[PDB]
Design a protein around this nucleic acid. Sequence first.
RNA 1: AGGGCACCACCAGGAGUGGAGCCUGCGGCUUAAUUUGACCAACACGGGAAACCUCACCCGGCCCGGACACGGACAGGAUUGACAGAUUGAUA
RNA 2: CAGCCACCCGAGAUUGAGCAAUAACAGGUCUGUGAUGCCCUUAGAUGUCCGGGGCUGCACGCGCGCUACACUGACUGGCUCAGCGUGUGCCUACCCUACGCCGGCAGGCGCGGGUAACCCGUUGAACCCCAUUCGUGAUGGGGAUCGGGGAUUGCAAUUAUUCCCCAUGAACGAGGAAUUCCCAGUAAGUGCGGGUCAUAAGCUUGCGUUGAUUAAGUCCCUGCCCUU
Lengths: 100, 75, 55, 96, 58, 124
Amino acid sequence: IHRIRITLTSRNVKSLEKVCADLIRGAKEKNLKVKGPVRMPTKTLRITTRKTPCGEGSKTWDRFQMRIHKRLIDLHSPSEIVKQITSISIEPGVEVEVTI
Amino acid sequence: QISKKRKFVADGIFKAELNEFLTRELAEDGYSGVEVRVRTEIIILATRTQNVLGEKGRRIRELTAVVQKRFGFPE
Amino acid sequence: GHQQLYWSHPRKFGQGSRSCRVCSNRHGLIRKYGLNMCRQCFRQYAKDIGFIKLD
Amino acid sequence: MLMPKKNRIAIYELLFKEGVMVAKKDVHMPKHPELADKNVPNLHVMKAMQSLKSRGYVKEQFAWRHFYWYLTNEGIQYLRDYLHLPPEIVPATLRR
Amino acid sequence: KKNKHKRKKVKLAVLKYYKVKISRLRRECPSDECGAGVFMASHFDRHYCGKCCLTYCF
Amino acid sequence: RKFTYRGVDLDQLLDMSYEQLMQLYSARQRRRLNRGLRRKQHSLLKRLRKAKKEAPPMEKPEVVKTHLRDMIILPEMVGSMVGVYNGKTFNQVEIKPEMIGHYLGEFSITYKPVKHGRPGIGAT
RNA sequence: AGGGCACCACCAGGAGUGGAGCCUGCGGCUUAAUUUGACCAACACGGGAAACCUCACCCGGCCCGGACACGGACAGGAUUGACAGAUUGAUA
RNA sequence: CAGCCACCCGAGAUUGAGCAAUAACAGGUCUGUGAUGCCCUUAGAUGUCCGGGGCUGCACGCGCGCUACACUGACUGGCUCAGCGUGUGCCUACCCUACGCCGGCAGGCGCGGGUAACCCGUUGAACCCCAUUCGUGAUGGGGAUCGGGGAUUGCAAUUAUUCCCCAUGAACGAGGAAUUCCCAGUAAGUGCGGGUCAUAAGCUUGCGUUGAUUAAGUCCCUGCCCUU
Ligand SMILES: [K+]
Ligand SMILES: [K+]
Ligand SMILES: [K+]
Ligand SMILES: [K+]
Ligand SMILES: [K+]
Ligand SMILES: [K+]
Ligand SMILES: [Mg+2]
Ligand SMILES: [Mg+2]
Ligand SMILES: [Mg+2]
Ligand SMILES: [Mg+2]
Ligand SMILES: [Mg+2]
Ligand SMILES: [Mg+2]
Ligand SMILES: [Mg+2]
Ligand SMILES: [Mg+2]
Ligand SMILES: [Mg+2]
Ligand SMILES: [Mg+2]
Ligand SMILES: [Mg+2]
Ligand SMILES: [Mg+2]
Ligand SMILES: [Zn+2]
Ligand SMILES: [Zn+2]
C-alpha cells in the first residue's frame, strides 16, 4: 500500500526508545514490513551565558544545553492500520509526525 | 512550518510562562506544578483542588478561557 | 498632529525594537533559537524551558 | 481616559460575553487582537479595564507581559445595567 | 510658561446657521461622510468643513 | 576663476535636475538622492526659496533655522542663510558654492575644542 | 620552633606582557552634556561592539497613558479634533 | 598494613568538565525583573514621546588586547586536508545560500534549494606543502596616518557604520624596573563557527588543524594550612 514514515522527536532518550520499541513491536504483531529505527544525529542546542546578574566578580559562565533526539520508522501498511498502530499510548515528551 | 530547535524551545517557553501564570494565580490554593499533555490537556496539581475549581467550576472555566485567549489555542 | 508624531520613530531594527518577553528589559538579550529573553530571566527559567547543565 | 463610546461599548460587550479579558501591556499596539474588526486600540482596552478594576468590577492578574482580567459579580451586575441586557443573559464562564 | 489653549464658548451656535420659511446661511459640506447636516465654516477667504477638513477657497 | 564643481559652473548646476546632479555628486550623495529626499528636506528647501524671494535686492536673505544636520547642500541652497542646530544652538552658516555636496552638520560643530588644564589629583 | 601544600608559588624552561603603532576599558582634563556602577575578589566587566532607538546625560518641544471617590460646571452643550494664514526645527 | 615505583598484556594503567559542606563578607547587583521597604518626584514631571547633540570629545597616567620589527620571511602562482555549529523568526521588520549573467572589486540582476544527516555542503579553511621574485637596505619588512573615487545597510552615515580601488608609507631593528600564563595533543602558531548583529569583531565563548622545549621536584620567594 502506501509507504508511511513516522518521525519521532524527543529530549528524553529512554522514553524515545521505549516508544520506538513499542511501535516496532506493534508493527511486528500486525506482520508489517518495518524498517528499523533510523537514528538521526543528535542535536545539541547550547547557550553559554555569564552567571552573574551584574558585571562583577570572576567571569564565570553557565553552559546550558538541550539535546534533541530524532528517530525514523518506515512502514508498508494501510493508513488505517498505521493510525491504529500509532494510537497506542505515547509517553509524554515524544512528538510523533506521520507522513504518507 | 518551523524548525525542530525552535519548536522545542517554544514548547519549553510556553510551559515556563504557563507555570509562572498559574503560580501567581493559584499561590494561595496550594498550586505545585502543571503538566501539559498534547485536544491539549493541562493538569494543575494543587493541595486544595476545591478552590482551584471554584464555585461550580467557574474559576477553572475562567482559567481555561484566559489560557486559550492568551496562547491562541482554537476555542 | 500628535497622532502623527507620537511613537513615529522607526523601530524595525536595533535594540529599541527588541525586549525581554518576560521583563521588557532591552539589555543582555538572547535571541538564539528565538528565545528572546534577557540573560537573567533565561537563567531563572532555563530548567523550566529544558536547558540543563550537563557540561 | 477620553474614549469613543462605541469603543467602550465594544470592550464591555466582549468582556461580558466572554467573562474574561486578556491584554498584552502594550500602549502602542494599534488593534486589540479580539477587537480588530472594531478598530479598538489596545490602550483603550487597557484603560477601560483599569477603570473597571478601580471600581471593583474586575479582578486583575499580571504575568510576564500580559494582563488577565476576570469579571466579578459586581462587575456582572454593573455591565448588565450598563448594556441593558436581559437578566437571562450571562457570561459564558457562568453559562457553561 | 507656555499657556494652554482655551476654547471660546459660543452661545447657541446652531442659531447662527439658520434663519426663520427656513434659510441655511452656512454652506453644507458636499461629502459622503458629512452630508447636509454638517455645515462648512465661512472664513474670510475660504469654506472649511470642520469634520473632514474639506476646504474650498474663494 | 569662476567656481566649478566637477568642471560645471554654478549656473549650469542650477539648471541641472536631480538625476543630472547625481552623476556629479560623490557616491554618498548620489545614493542619498537616489533614495530620495523626504518631507522635512522639501520643507527646508521651500523655506529657503521663500527667504530668497523675500530678500531685498543686494541683501542677504533672512536666516532659516533647522535641525537637519544631515541635509545635502544642493546648488539651489547656495547663498542661503541657515541656522544649523548643533544640539544646543543654531549656528549661522552662509552657504558657499564650495560647500556643495557636504552636510550642513559639517559646518555646525557640536563640541567645544579642548583646551587642557592642569591634571587633577592622582592621574599619575 | 617544627611540619605540609599550590605553575592563580618557585625551580627547569616555553610563549609572552611591560618598549612601538593601533583597538578597546579606567582615571584625569575638557564640556551644555561628555549618564552611570565597579578600584587578588574594579579597569574587551555590567554580556556595555551607544549614528537614531538603546539612554539613564545636555538643549528644546508635544502628550496624559492624573484610576477611583467627592464637589462644581454643563444637552440653551462638559468637552474633542482641525483647513488655511501666522508660528515652529517640524505638516506638534 | 595502607600504599608507592617499574614492567607485561592492553584502546586505555591519572582525559576534560559539571556539581560541590559548616561558617562568613556590611564583597557586587534596587541600571534584569509586574522582586521589594522607606525616601524623593509626579503635569513648567525625575512619567512618556519627538527632534538635535553627547556617551567617541584630548597636554597626560594605567589595564586587557591586535599587528609587527622580517629570509625559520614577504610576494606571485600551483597543489592539498577539518571540526564545532547556525540558517526563513508571535509581536518582529531582519534567514543560510547553490547556479546563470553583468562588473576589475566591493557589488548588482535573474532563477532555484533548504523550517534542514535532505539545501548551502564532499562545509575545496588558514597555517602547512611545491615552485617564483626579492636579497640584509626602515627593504617588495610594517601598515599607522592621510587625499581622491566607487558600493552596501539604514528613515538618517558629517564627528569618517561597514566594504572596495588607486595613492600616501609613521613608529617599530626584539623592548628598563617589573610582571603573567602554562607540563601533553598541553604551550605556541593557524584559521573557522556561535553571541552581540539592519549594518558588524582587534572582544568573548566554542571548534578543529600543525605541534614542541623543560620537569616528575621543593618550601627558596609568594601565599594558604596544621602542631607545639
Ligand atoms: K612586549
Ligand atoms: K537586583
Ligand atoms: K528600591
Ligand atoms: K527597581
Ligand atoms: K547597565
Ligand atoms: K537584562
Ligand atoms: Mg604571581
Ligand atoms: Mg621563573
Ligand atoms: Mg604596550
Ligand atoms: Mg584566590
Ligand atoms: Mg558604533
Ligand atoms: Mg543616542
Ligand atoms: Mg533622543
Ligand atoms: Mg558594600
Ligand atoms: Mg563609553
Ligand atoms: Mg608588506
Ligand atoms: Mg618601506
Ligand atoms: Mg563586549
Ligand atoms: Zn528579562
Ligand atoms: Zn466635510
